[PDB]
């Protein structure tokens, strides 16, 4: 997809993530588990809901064919009537099929964008307090218990709180 | 020793529903919405409780002039729409023509 | 019914239908298409 996340650097989706479209899986001394990102999920639902409504609203006034009859010496106007009615039905068939293919392309890229932005939201909070593994996961250089994990998921991660613990660990590793 | 981890990921399920885009066809997705009605009941019905006038083997001309084969329609109650066959057999029994017939049928379309 | 066509009546809340162009009542909009499906969810890979 355009944003490189879904079936991209994140190899596949999670059957285990049932309560959000995008979210997290963590593992620490306390255990492991899934959690939805409810904010990005809700934003995306709102966008798709509006999209569906927009598409239907804009098609709300389109052409309505009406039966009209003509006698055997009104063939020219009969033919003009047929072409006119068919002409609008072709315009509107095109408008609907095309709009649906275009918006479908945009919806699937919108999801990819949302996953990418969630990953970056975590990446830019953690900075060098964790290692990027390249597969959508981060390995922390400090212990990160459940309240700490929740601070990452809710955008309140406190980098200064853990920066010295992480520095010591980064140095241990880099010193070999 | 391996550290704690957090991973970012996204919903997957067992859906086999597919949609099309401009660059791709038959893309499998978690969820989709059909927006096209393809079914009907094959019958002619009352419209919001009001029965249509169904002329059977009679034409509009046969009804209004009173072709005696059209006696079902000697008096007809209020209708919602009228149904006429493509080529009704009971029309002008004594042959001839009905002047401005299509214009009359147009008027009937608002009565 | 609330929507009648010469082939049969329609009972539906879909925005579109492909039954017949000449309808009366409160109907969906007619198109010639055989399929219109909007994506809502994500790409779902094996």
């Amino acid at each position, epitope marked *: 997809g355009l944003f490189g996340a879904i079936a991209g650097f994140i190899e596949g989706g999670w059957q285990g993530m*049932v*309560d*959000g*479209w995008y979210g997290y899986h963590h593992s620490n001394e306390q255990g492991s588990g899934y959690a*939805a990102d*409810k904010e990005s*999920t*809700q934003k995306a*639902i*709102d966008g*798709v*809901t509006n999209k*569906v*409504n927009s598409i*239907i609203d804009k098609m709300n006034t389109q052409f309505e064919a009406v039966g009209r009859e003509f006698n055997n010496l009104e063939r020219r106007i009969e033919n003009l009537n047929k072409k006119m009615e068919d002409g609008f039905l072709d315009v509107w068939t095109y408008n609907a099929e095309l709009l649906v293919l275009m918006e479908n392309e945009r919806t699937l890229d919108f999801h990819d964008s949302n996953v990418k932005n969630l990953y970056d939201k975590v990446r830019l909070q953690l900075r060098d307090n964790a290692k990027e593994l390249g597969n959508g996961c981060f390995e922390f250089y400090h212990k990160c218990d459940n309240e700490c994990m929740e601070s990452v998921r809710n955008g309140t991660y406190d980098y200064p709180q853990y920066s010295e613990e992480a520095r010591l660990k980064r140095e241990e590793i880099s010193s070999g | 020793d391996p550290g704690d981890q957090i991973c970012i990921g996204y919903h997957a399920n067992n859906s086999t529903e597919q949609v099309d885009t401009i660059m791709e066809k038959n893309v499998t997705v*978690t*969820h989709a*919405q059909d*927006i096209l009605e393809k079914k009907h009941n094959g019958k002619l019905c009352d419209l919001d409780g009001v029965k249509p006038l169904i002329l059977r083997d009679c034409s509009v001309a046969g009804w209004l002039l009173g072709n005696p084969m059209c006696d079902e329609f000697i008096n007809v109650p209020e209708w919602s729409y009228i149904v006429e066959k493509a080529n009704p057999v009971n029309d002008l029994c004594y042959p001839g023509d009905f002047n401005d017939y299509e214009e009359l049928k147009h008027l009937l379309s608002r009565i | 019914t609330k929507c009648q066509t010469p082939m049969g009546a329609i009972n539906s*809340s*879909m*925005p579109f239908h492909n039954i017949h162009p000449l309808t009366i009542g409160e109907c969906p909009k007619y198109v010639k298409s055989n399929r219109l499906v909007l994506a*809502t*969810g994500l790409r779902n890979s094996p």
Partner: antibody, heavy 121, light 110 residues
Framework: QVQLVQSGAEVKKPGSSVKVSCKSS????????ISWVRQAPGQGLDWMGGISPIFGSTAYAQKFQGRVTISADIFSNTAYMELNSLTSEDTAVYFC??????????????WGQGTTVTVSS | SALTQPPAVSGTPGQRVTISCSGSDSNIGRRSVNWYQQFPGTAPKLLIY???QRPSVVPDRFSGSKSGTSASLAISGLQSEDEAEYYCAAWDDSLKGAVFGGGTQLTVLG
């Protein structure tokens, strides 16, 4: 300001099925979860399940799994609950209620007026 | 059940009254509590959500709290219009479903 308006009272015989509707008026509820919650006479609230139709989720209480079908029509902004194999144990008022967001954890803040179902031979 | 409440509480106009809610680790323990108020024959109203949060339309005399696997609704300054049934509620991760307490009937004395 959205209101949820439910269908009218139902009188049903044993073994039959009832399908109650919940229309969101004054605005859509398609971007939220709506639950169905029933209250038997003199008893407490009891969750039946819910649906969040754009998100794509339908959930059911284990105790009603298999006997209840919850569904939605996003185009008419309506949610439905169909309960099958009715007995007098199902005589209750059934409410639809909308959650504060797309899923079932959040407080239910908008409620329908309720629909009485009375099951009797 | 799953959540357990006293069937009845009472107070006088202006008194402080509290209503308890006992749960388990699979609900109150690990999930947020919502409270609902219901007058007879009418639908419930959301009073508190996320343990202690109050909708803007709900008077500030209503407050909630959660500790351990227990929760409490407090009504400071009881008013006559508060006579109603009160329900606590939470998601339960073992049942994978929403649960409710059995309800408490509040009587305003006097």
């Amino acid at each position: 300001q959205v209101q949820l308006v439910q269908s009218g009272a139902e009188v049903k015989k044993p073994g039959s099925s009832v399908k109650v509707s919940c229309k969101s008026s004054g605005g859509t509820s398609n971007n939220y979860a709506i639950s169905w919650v029933r209250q038997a006479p003199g008893q407490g609230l009891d969750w039946m399940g819910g649906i969040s139709p754009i998100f794509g989720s339908t959930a059911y209480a284990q105790k009603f799994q298999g006997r209840v079908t919850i569904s939605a029509d996003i185009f008419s902004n309506t949610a439905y609950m169909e309960l099958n194999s009715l007995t007098s144990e199902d005589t209750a008022v059934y409410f639809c209620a909308r959650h504060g967001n797309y899923y079932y954890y959040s407080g239910m803040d908008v409620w329908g007026q309720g629909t009485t179902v009375t099951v009797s031979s | 059940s799953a959540l357990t409440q006293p069937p009845a509480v009472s107070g006088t106009p202006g008194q402080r009254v509290t209503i308890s809610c006992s749960g388990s680790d699979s609900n109150i323990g690990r999930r947020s509590v919502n409270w609902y108020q219901q007058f007879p024959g009418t639908a419930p109203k959301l009073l508190i959500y996320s343990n202690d949060q109050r909708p803007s339309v709900v008077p500030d005399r209503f407050s909630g709290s959660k500790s351990g696997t227990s929760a409490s609704l407090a009504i400071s300054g009881l008013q006559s219009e508060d006579e109603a049934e009160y329900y606590c509620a939470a998601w339960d991760d073992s049942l994978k479903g929403a649960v409710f307490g059995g309800g408490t009937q509040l009587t305003v004395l006097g």
